[PDB]
Design a protein around this ligand. Structure first.
Ligand code: HEM
Ligand code: HEM
Ligand code: H4B
Ligand code: H4B
Ligand code: K8F
Ligand code: K8F
Ligand code: CL
Ligand code: CL
Ligand code: GD
Ligand code: GD
Ligand code: ZN
Lengths: 401, 401
């Protein structure tokens, strides 16, 4: 009744008693496992009591005066208004816990260090842009990246909502041709089409930084040229392959997800961008080598004069490793926070041991924690993991169209 | 009906075969346990009935005279004897379907090409050993490997099982050491202790081939040494790094799993060893580089002059790539069948397309299908998969000791 979890490298066993708190049902049934799939009125009082109890237990103040008090005012707020406002300290606690509960994040060893900006009195895209711009420069911090989340107003009935129409705050463009294919990033060919449609002059480059499309409630989105000084980017060069610089590759410093719905205590924030710092396989393996992304793998292999005529030469594996080397080398010479996948997974193993002592386990999505190159060379590969949904949480949400 | 996406191409299929999945798996809507390694005549009747239905569908004779004859016959024999006997053609189809149904096997493009050896008339451990020697010889075929299975008598009321105590037919010894360590393969310390306990005179090399421990019904296990010239081995060398041959590493040609139970229409064969050929990553990455196996990675990177003081140099990844290069080149030099992870995952993609057209789906365990290096460089990384249990099946079973 409590899942037995083994680590096959060392042979240690733990039990995930924490999984007994799984709220939102997952996709799996005894008949079939769906773990490999990417996207698989007064109910607000159940989700709020549980959250407020979470807060006070975590400050050793369960079951004492201040706990009762906070229970009544949310009772009376929703009674009067049909929703409630979070205290500053609660929202801070809610933000850090959602990160801590994100089963796909390998960087949660950092969950306790999180800078929370409160944009709950926001109104109009003119202010949105400023709140985002405060975040970006704070998080970027001239290359010493700092984790941050900005929280725009929550959701109320009978009124439109705040949304960042882009998936991230920094994304490159994707342009079709006289032949359908793409110059730039193929992942963003849709939002790129929206920006052009909404009044932005298309560029001629593989690495044009898209403009933001920000949406105040019930009003049509507005384009916003991000200040180029605010967008810190890293030209890519290799330590010893002098020609690599010539391939003209860049990536941007700050990975800032802007499309996920933060959910705290039954309250929903459709705009709540969080940012951290990249793990290098994200950029070098996925962004640049995925066949449907920049798909640079064979071009780096020609430059290395590899045998691309036979798969058993492992030319793919070789080119990919050096691409990752160039990424790490480039972020370090530019002095931008980045972590390699060996350091990151080792830290996650340390995270799991922390969490086992602290909360009785940790929800983890094996298919996403295990890096996309050299999987079984990292210790998470040999760690069994239990996936489930805890609250508060980051959730995916529809696109607003 | 679960919907399944390929993220490299965009295509979408629905896995309707999943609806027929019989025995239940480890996951619930509360929590996924996909990453875990090791998760009455009337039911015998119902299992058998369904298998017979399958077999008569496969010969394009569903609902014919022969079909009802067999259904009625099996109830008769279960009524009279508590069990029944497979016809030979049924046993060949059921061994093939069992491979076909194995969710963790990436080599299933070959499932129809399988050589079925009927040893259900076997009587002793000594006759068992001769059947096994003939399997190894046929399958090895002087380095031109052929897929085979040998099927020993089924579990039955009144008598104990046949069992092969070794987990594979070819395995290297693992001796505990003077300072707690293991010389040889640490995966095989238990079975090495059992061979010694049963009169085997141990060696002291790192690549000592283990003898067979064979269990006849209601007998102690009997020890059998494999004829040296029956076990084709491959010395490992690297096509450019000449110092690599001085590591003295070898692996054997034939991967023959022998501790799994074959289930066909409710009948159980606890002894039914099967073999194919290796994918290069099993040897190069897992068997040689796992920290709890031969653990050669650091020593190779030192020889390569890599800088092992910092993870960010990707010395682990670079050293592993060459070990796989070495495995592939050595088996081609020796003219021993081998497939790399790029070819193998590309054939597994064709298997999923063939299987979609033929059965409406295909069971697959993503975390086992994706190679342990260069995961997202193969096409199976970007393929969602549904995992479930079909019969006939190979199943794990406890050790007989
Ligand atoms: C501080 C350094 C951080 C690192 C190194 C890191 C690393 C990663 C990586 C590699 C992924 C896999 C995502 C993918 O491959 O698409 C991920 C997922 C995720 N992370 Fe983090 N992260 C960091 C900070 C954060 C922060 C600050 C938050 C929120 C407060 C966060 C929340 C999430 C969420 C919600 C996901 C799942 C997103 C998805 O599935 O698309 N992470 N993280
Ligand atoms: C002919 C070439 C074959 C290739 C390239 C191949 C490939 C593989 C690989 C790479 C694995 C994962 C192994 C691991 O990581 O330990 C696997 C598992 C498996 N294969 Fe295949 N295989 C082949 C033949 C066969 C045959 C002939 C059968 C049965 C008739 C079979 C049944 C299985 C089963 C049951 C598993 C799961 C083993 C386990 O979970 O312990 N395979 N295979
Ligand atoms: C189909 C497959 O589950 C899917 O491509 C997943 C696998 N693991 C992943 N892991 C990470 N970190 N990011 C991803 O996008 C994916 N994709
Ligand atoms: C815990 C984890 O599931 C375990 O280490 C698995 C992962 N995937 C695997 N995949 C294959 N093919 N073989 C394995 O041994 C494993 N080990
Ligand atoms: C906070 C954070 C840190 C990090 N190191 N990396 C990311 C990547 C998130 C991008 N993911 C791809 C997607 F679109 F699915 C979302 C986010
Ligand atoms: C037939 C076959 C083919 C192949 N290519 N590889 C294997 C190895 C399977 C070994 N697996 C490790 C375990 F013990 F879990 C079982 C078997
Ligand atoms: Cl990204
Ligand atoms: Cl093996
Ligand atoms: Gd040249
Ligand atoms: Gd050389
Ligand atoms: Zn599952």
């Amino acid at each position: 009744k409590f899942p037995r979890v083994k680590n096959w490298e060392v042979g240690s066993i733990t039990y995930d008693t924490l999984s007994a708190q799984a709220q939102q049902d997952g996709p799996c049934t005894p008949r079939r496992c769906l773990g490999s799939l990417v996207f698989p009125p007064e109910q607000l009082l159940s989700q709020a009591r549980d959250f407020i109890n979470q807060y006070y237990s975590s400050i050793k103040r369960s079951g004492s005066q201040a706990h009762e008090q906070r229970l009544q005012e949310v009772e009376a707020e929703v009674a009067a208004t049909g929703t409630y406002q979070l205290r500053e300290s609660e929202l801070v606690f809610g933000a850090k816990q959602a990160w801590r509960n994100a089963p796909r994040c390998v960087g949660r060893i950092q969950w306790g260090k999180l800078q929370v900006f409160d944009a709950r009195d926001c109104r109009s895209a003119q202010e949105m842009f400023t709140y985002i711009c405060n975040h970006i420069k704070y998080a970027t911090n001239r290359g010493n990246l700092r984790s941050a989340i900005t929280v725009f107003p929550q959701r109320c009935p009978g009124r439109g909502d705040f949304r960042i129409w882009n998936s991230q705050l920094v994304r490159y463009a994707g342009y079709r041709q006289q032949d359908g294919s793409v110059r730039g990033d193929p992942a963003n060919v849709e939002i790129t089409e929206l920006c052009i449609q909404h009044g932005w002059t298309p560029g001629n480059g593989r690495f044009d930084v898209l403009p933001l499309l920000l949406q105040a409630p019930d009003e049509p989105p507005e384009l916003f040229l991000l200040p180029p000084e605010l967008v810190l980017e890293v030209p890519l060069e290799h330590p010893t392959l002098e020609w690599f610089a010539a391939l003209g590759l860049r990536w941007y410093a700050l990975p800032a997800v802007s499309n996920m719905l933060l959910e705290i205590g039954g309250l929903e924030f459709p705009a709540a961008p969080f940012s951290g710092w990249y793990m290098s396989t994200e950029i070098g393996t996925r962004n640049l080598c995925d066949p449907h992304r920049y798909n640079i793998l064979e071009d780096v292999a020609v430059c290395m004069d590899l045998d691309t005529r036979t798969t058993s030469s492992l030319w793919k594996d070789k080119a990919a490793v050096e691409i990752n080397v160039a990424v790490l080398h480039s972020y370090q010479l530019a002095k931008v926070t980045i972590v390699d996948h060996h350091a990151a997974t080792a830290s996650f193993m340390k995270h799991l041991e922390n969490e086992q002592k602290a909360r009785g386990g940790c929800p983890a999505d094996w298919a996403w924690i295990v890096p996309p190159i050299s999987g079984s060379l990292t210790p998470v590969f040999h760690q069994e993991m239990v996936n489930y949904f805890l609250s508060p949480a980051f959730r995916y949400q529809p696109d607003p169209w």
